[PDB]
Design a protein around this ligand. Structure first.
Ligand code: RET
Ligand code: OLA
Ligand code: OLA
Ligand code: OLA
Ligand code: OLA
Ligand code: OLA
Ligand code: OLA
Ligand code: OLA
Ligand code: CL
Ligand code: CL
Length: 264
C-alpha cells in the first residue's frame, strides 16, 4: 500500500537510505547520553523536561533502528538492483510512534513554560488530543498513497486542521507565558516556537511526496525529509529545551545549574 513497495532501487539509492537511517540512530543515541549527563544540572521543577528528551531519543532511535533493519530485510540485490523480497517496508510504524513521541515533545515545552497543576493538565490534555487526531487521520491517509491519492489528500486536509489548531494552542501558550520565564529564556522560547513551525511542517511535505514525486527518487526524498525533520524536531529542539531548563534553574538559584554554566 506504500509507494516504497512499487520500485526497485539502485545500489546508490538503497545504500543512501540505509545510511540516512543508521546516521539517524547514531545521532539520537549520542544525544541521549548528553541529555542524561546534563540532567543533574537541572532543577527539580524542570528536570522532567530533560528526562523527556532522553525518552524521545530512545523512542525515535528505536524506530529509526527498526526502519533500517526492515529496509535491509525487505530488499536484496538481484539482477543489478535492490528488489523487494518476502518482508515488507513501511513508514506506517513512524505514525504509531508519533502517538508517544509527539506528546513527549509537547509536554517538555509546557514544563519549561512554567505551567503547573490544573493549567498544565488541561493544556496537555487538549494538546495531546489534537496531536492524536492529527496522527490518526494522517495514518489513515497514507494507507491510500498508492491506491487513492484523492483520499490521501482529504485525510491530509483533516489532519492539517488538527495540526493548525494544535500549533495555535502551542503559540498561544508560548507567547502568553513568555513573560514568566527567567534568565533571558523569554527570548529563547520564541525561537523554539519557530523551530517547531519549521521542523514539524516537513512531515506533511513528506506525506505529500507520493502526490508530486511518485518514483524511487521520491522515496529517497521522503527519507531525507524525515531525517532533517527528526533531527530538528527532536534533537535540536531538545537541546534548546534543556538549555532553557538549565538557564531558568540557574536563575532560580539552583546551584548545580549555576556551577555548570560557570564552567562554560
Ligand atoms: C518527532 C516526530 C514529529 C515531531 C512528528 C510530527 C508529525 C507531524 C507534524 C505530522 C503532520 C501531518 C500532517 C499535518 C498532515 C499529513 C499527515 C501528517 C500526520 C504527516
Ligand atoms: C556529506 C556527504 C553526503 C553523502 C552523500 C551520499 C550520496 C551518495 O554517495 O550516493
Ligand atoms: C539538521 C539537518 C540534518 C541533515 C541530515 C542529512 C545529512 C545528509 C544529507 C544528504 C546530502 C545529499 C546526498 C546526495 C544524494 C544522492 C542521491 C542518491 O544517491 O540517491
Ligand atoms: C554507553 C554510555 C554509558 C553512559 C553512562 C553514564 C552514566 C552517567 C552518570 C550520572 O551522571 O548519573
Ligand atoms: C477511520 C476513521 C478514523 C477516525 C479518526 C478519529 C479522529 C481522532 C480524534 C482525536 C482522538
Ligand atoms: C474526525 C474526522 C473524521 C473524518 C472526517 C471526514 C473527512 C475525511 C474522510 C474521508 C473519507 C473518504 O475519503 O472516504
Ligand atoms: C526545502 C526544505 C525546507 C522547507 C522549509 C519550509 C517549510 C516550513 C515553513 C514554516
Ligand atoms: C547551520 C546551523 C545549524 C544549527 C545547529 C543547532 C545546534 C544546537 C542548538 C543548541 C541550542 C542552544 C540554544 C541557544 C543558546 C543561546 O541562546 O545562547
Ligand atoms: Cl526546583
Ligand atoms: Cl518518533
Amino acid at each position: 500500500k506504500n509507494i516504497e513497495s512499487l520500485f526497485d532501487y539502485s545500489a546508490g539509492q538503497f545504500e543512501f537510505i540505509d545510511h540516512l537511517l543508521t546516521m539517524g540512530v547514531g545521532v539520537h543515541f549520542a544525544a541521549l547520553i548528553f541529555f542524561l549527563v546534563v540532567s543533574q544540572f537541572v532543577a527539580p521543577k524542570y528536570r522532567i523536561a530533560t528526562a523527556l528528551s532522553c525518552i524521545v531519543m530512545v523512542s525515535a532511535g528505536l524506530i529509526l533502528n527498526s526502519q533500517a533493519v526492515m529496509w535491509t530485510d525487505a530488499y536484496a540485490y538481484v539482477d543489478g538492483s535492490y528488489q523487494l523480497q518476502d518482508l515488507t517496508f513501511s513508514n506506517g510504524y513512524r505514525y504509531v510512534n508519533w502517538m508517544a513521541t509527539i506528546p513527549c515533545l509537547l509536554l517538555q515545552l509546557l514544563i519549561v513554560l512554567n505551567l503547573k497543576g490544573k493549567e498544565l493538565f488541561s493544556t496537555a490534555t487538549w494538546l495531546i488530543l489534537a496531536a492524536w487526531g492529527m496522527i490518526i487521520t494522517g495514518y489513515v491517509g497514507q494507507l491510500y498513497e498508492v491506491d487513492d491519492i484523492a483520499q490521501l489528500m482529504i485525510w491530509g486536509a483533516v489532519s492539517t486542521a488538527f495540526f493548525v489548531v494544535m500549533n495555535w494552542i502551542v503559540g498561544t501558550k508560548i507567547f502568553k507565558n513568555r513573560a514568566t520565564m527567567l534568565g533571558g529564556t523569554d527570548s529563547t522560547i520564541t525561537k523554539v516556537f519557530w523551530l517547531m513551525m519549521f521542523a514539524w511542517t516537513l512531515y506533511p511535505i513528506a506525506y505529500l511526496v507520493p502526490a508530486f514525486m511518485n518514483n524511487a527518487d521520491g522515496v529517497v526524498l521522503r527519507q531525507l525529509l524525515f531525517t532533517i525533520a527528526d533531527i530538528s524536531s527532536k534533537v535540536i529542539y531538545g537541546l534548546m529545551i534543556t538549555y532553557i531548563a538549565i538557564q531558568q534553574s540557574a536563575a532560580a538559584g539552583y546551584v548545580p545549574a549555576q556551577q555548570a554554566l560557570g564552567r562554560i
